[PDB]
Amino acid sequence: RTIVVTTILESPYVMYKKNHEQLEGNERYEGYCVDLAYEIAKHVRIKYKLSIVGDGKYGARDPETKIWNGMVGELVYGRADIAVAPLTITLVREEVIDFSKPFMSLGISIMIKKGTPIESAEDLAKQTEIAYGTLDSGSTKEFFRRSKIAVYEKMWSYMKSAEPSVFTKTTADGVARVRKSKGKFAFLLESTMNEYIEQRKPCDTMKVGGNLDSKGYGVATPKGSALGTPVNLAVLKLSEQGILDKLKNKWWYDKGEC
Amino acid sequence: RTIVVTTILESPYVMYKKNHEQLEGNERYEGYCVDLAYEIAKHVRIKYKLSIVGDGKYGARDPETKIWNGMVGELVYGRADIAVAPLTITLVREEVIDFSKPFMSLGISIMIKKGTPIESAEDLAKQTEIAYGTLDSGSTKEFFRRSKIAVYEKMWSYMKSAEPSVFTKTTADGVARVRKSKGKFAFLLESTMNEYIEQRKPCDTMKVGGNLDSKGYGVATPKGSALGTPVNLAVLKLSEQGILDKLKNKWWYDKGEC
Numbered sequence: 088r089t090i091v092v093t094t095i096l097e098s099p100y101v102m103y104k105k106n107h108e109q110l111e112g113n114e115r116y117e118g119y120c121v122d123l124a125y126e127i128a129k130h131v132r133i134k135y136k137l138s139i140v141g142d143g144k145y146g147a148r149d150p151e152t153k154i155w156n157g158m159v160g161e162l163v164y165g166r167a168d169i170a171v172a173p174l175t176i177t178l179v180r181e182e183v184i185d186f187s188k189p190f191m192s193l194g195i196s197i198m199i200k201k202g203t204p205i206e207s208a209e210d211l212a213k214q215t216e217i218a219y220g221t222l223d224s225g226s227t228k229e230f231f232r233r234s235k236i237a238v239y240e241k242m243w244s245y246m247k248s249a250e251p252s253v254f255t256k257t258t259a260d261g262v263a264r265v266r267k268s269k270g271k272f273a274f275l276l277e278s279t280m281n282e283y284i285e286q287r288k289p290c291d292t293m294k295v296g297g298n299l300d301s302k303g304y305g306v307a308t309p310k311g312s313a314l315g316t317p318v319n320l321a322v323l324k325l326s327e328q329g330i331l332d333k334l335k336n337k338w339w340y341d342k343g344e345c
Numbered sequence: 346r347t348i349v350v351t352t353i354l355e356s357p358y359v360m361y362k363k364n365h366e367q368l369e370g371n372e373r374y375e376g377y378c379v380d381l382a383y384e385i386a387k388h389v390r391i392k393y394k395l396s397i398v399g400d401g402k403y404g405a406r407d408p409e410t411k412i413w414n415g416m417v418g419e420l421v422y423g424r425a426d427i428a429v430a431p432l433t434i435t436l437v438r439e440e441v442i443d444f445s446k447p448f449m450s451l452g453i454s455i456m457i458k459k460g461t462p463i464e465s466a467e468d469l470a471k472q473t474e475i476a477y478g479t480l481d482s483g484s485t486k487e488f489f490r491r492s493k494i495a496v497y498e499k500m501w502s503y504m505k506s507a508e509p510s511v512f513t514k515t516t517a518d519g520v521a522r523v524r525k526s527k528g529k530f531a532f533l534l535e536s537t538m539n540e541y542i543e544q545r546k547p548c549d550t551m552k553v554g555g556n557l558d559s560k561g562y563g564v565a566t567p568k569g570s571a572l573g574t575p576v577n578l579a580v581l582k583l584s585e586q587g588i589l590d591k592l593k594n595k596w597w598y599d600k601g602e603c
């Protein structure tokens with residue numbers, strides 16, 4: 088009866104509240120995706136419990152074992168009913184779970200320390216004084232691994248052999264590396280996280296140039312679930328009421344520190 | 346066996362070629378959605394025929410008869426297998442047909458003649474010297490009709506009573522009215538058409554301000570169709586190959602006249 092909603096810690100989508108150790112159940116979390124889960128549950132009329140995904144991953148298939156990890160895996164193996172997180176809509180995931188229409192749009196983008204002489208991906212690809220990298224797993228890394236576009240193929244060729252490794256484990260690590268590189272590191276990450284960080288102190292990063300692609304985050308359910316259709320319609324309803332726009336403003340811009 | 350693909354004339358999505366009267370079948374049309382139909386058909390492996398929708402409408406339900414008109418109606422009543430056009434993904438349509446993930450993103454936007462002193466929707470709502478309106482039917486008009494947001498409610502209140510009528514029948518009429526108003530008419534229309542027109546001679550219009558909402562166009566199929574899943578995956582595949590970006594550039598920007 089109580090619906091299991093898998094998600095993952097990532098600012099400002101899902102975060103522990105400051106006093107979370109005094110709170111219980113859903114009340115210990117806050118963020119965009121926390122607010123979105125509450126609005127979807129009200130429209131679909133369900134009771135639910137937020138569960139943080141055990142392995143801390145989003146979702147990819149191990150090439151050797153064929154096992155799906157992360158939140159995707161939770162849905163595929165029947166351990167969760169719905170995933171609500173910044174889970175990028177990609178063909179390999181859509182083949183195994185269902186995604187709602189997108190609740191947020193985004194693209195891969197470039198984050199630099201203010202003053203770095205880079206304005207585009209082409210600017211990065213042409214040189215190597217300024218190192219650049221992606222998270223060590225995820226949709227952005229796969230974008231580069233799989234691209235057949237000249238400039239991105241060149242970038243992937245550089246990133247896979249660069250030493251020391253240009254890959255980072257978490258968004259916070261990628262950000263700290265831009266901040267502590269003295270302008271010699273640029274981080275390639277989703278425009279949404281890039282936009283959020285650009286409004287946080289110390290106000291020393293910025294998003295530069297256009298995005299390299301155009302995609303969306305979606306709410307995900309197992310294939311065949313009776314919740315899929317109602318969740319999808321709930322997302323469109325919230326879009327048309329202006330609620331997704333209000334939530335983005337609330338968590339990115341209303342209390343922007345810059 | 347041959348798949349019926351319903352669509353509609355709208356530049357630069359679907360247009361007759363200059364010598365179309367000497368050509369037959371699919372070869373008489375060209376445009377973004379013509380190229381998109383060809384790429385989807387190749388991936389899904391189907392033979393198809395493009396049919397221009399008889400009533401020249403996109404899709405809405407008559408409040409008296411309950412009958413669906415336009416391309417949506419063609420799908421619902423079984424007269425077409427797929428619709429490929431700038432058909433906006435909206436909750437009322439998604440309740441009755443299936444949409445693919447979005448192949449293009451867009452929002453309602455404002456088109457002005459160069460020099461008009463308007464930079465936002467708030468600027469329009471505050472005054473009446475510069476008249477403003479939408480197409481007489483479609484998603485944009487319904488956006489305003491249904492909005493509960495203060496500024497848009499005020500705009501809808503003005504538009505519904507304004508005399509002479511601020512509504513127009515077609516994009517071309519709305520555009521001609523901006524061009525022939527001497528700066529006293531602004532047209533509210535989807536950002537995609539706004540962007541296209543801004544690159545056509547005489548180069549005297551522009552898109553101003555941000556978009557008022559954020560949505561997408563989708564390829565549509567009847568509910569239950571065996572083509573729905575393969576079409577959806579085809580759209581994601583083309584997105585990830587960069588083909589949707591290439592097609593947008595081809596039809597909007599590569600031969601831009603401005």
Ligand SMILES: C=C(C)[C@H]1CN[C@H](C(=O)O)[C@H]1CC(=O)O
Pocket residue numbers: 097145173174175222224225226227228258275276277
């Ligand atoms: C935060 C992470 C690791 C996630 C979020 N969206 C992508 C995903 O759904 O794969 C990942 C980021 C990216 O790959 O840059």
Ligand SMILES: C=C(C)[C@H]1CN[C@H](C(=O)O)[C@H]1CC(=O)O
Pocket residue numbers: 355403431432433480482483484485486516533534535
């Ligand atoms: C061209 C037209 C009348 C269509 C295209 N997209 C919207 C639709 O799918 O309703 C309409 C435009 C708009 O309402 O501004």
Ligand SMILES: [Zn+2]
Pocket residue numbers: 107108
């Ligand atoms: Zn704790």
Ligand SMILES: [Zn+2]
Pocket residue numbers: 365366
């Ligand atoms: Zn003819």
